[PDB]
Amino acid sequence: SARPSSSMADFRKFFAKAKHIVIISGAGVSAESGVPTFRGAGGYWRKWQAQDLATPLAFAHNPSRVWEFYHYRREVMGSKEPNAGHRAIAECETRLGKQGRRVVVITQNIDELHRKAGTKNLLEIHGSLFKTRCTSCGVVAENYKSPICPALSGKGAPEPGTQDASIPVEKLPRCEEAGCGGLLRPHVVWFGENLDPAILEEVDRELAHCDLCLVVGTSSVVYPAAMFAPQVAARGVPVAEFNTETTPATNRFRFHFQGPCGTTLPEALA
């Protein structure tokens, strides 16, 4: 069989010399903090997974339901914090940056735990649970309010059987800019939407110049993110995958380190 190396010594040879390290992170990193991701092993919200609710069409049809889901997700972050994987990554960035070596995190996650852990060079390619965008005027705003709007207070219960709140659109979250009052939506990239062109340019720049790439906690089923680390590997650059399981991309990489990132990464990035 054709399986990548699990030699930490061999990895460390590349790590010691890298001037430009790209770390791609996914839902497995957030899962280690207890964040429910609602895909793969990450559970269900009522009857649904993220693929069912995080879509333009779900939000067209039942914007109260989609906002209930995102509200639940916002509110549970109250009890979720960065883990040893987040900290290994942030500390590595800090330590390497003092030596003039660059570390950039490209994250699929929307829960801002890499920000909270102190990562500075962060590309949030799918947006943020704590940002809104207006469906009419297009302005993006940071929003941490708990609850986001009065009508959502105590709604979002995840239990199967929980009935739709059916909040009238006028009482869901609304633009507060002079003269808009649009419906807001979460500033999150949904299935079926494209990624911001500006961010993808920044991503391609990092991938084209990096000399080592880590893919951490990624199922490597969500595109286009899942295509980033294979592209690096095809330039001959070493790519190490850190994940609890093998994925469809595993055999494209030079290393696979099995386990929770919070166990493997502090060792790898030391």
């Binding site: 895909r39 693929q51 799918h126 990239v189 949904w190 299935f191 079926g192 939407e193 494209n194 990624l195 062109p197 993808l200 089923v221 969500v222 595109y223 286009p224 899942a226 469809p248």
Partner: peptide, 7 residues
């Protein structure tokens, strides 16, 4: 555009 999906 460059579009989001899951396999």
């Amino acid at each position: 555009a460059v579009t989001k999906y899951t396999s």
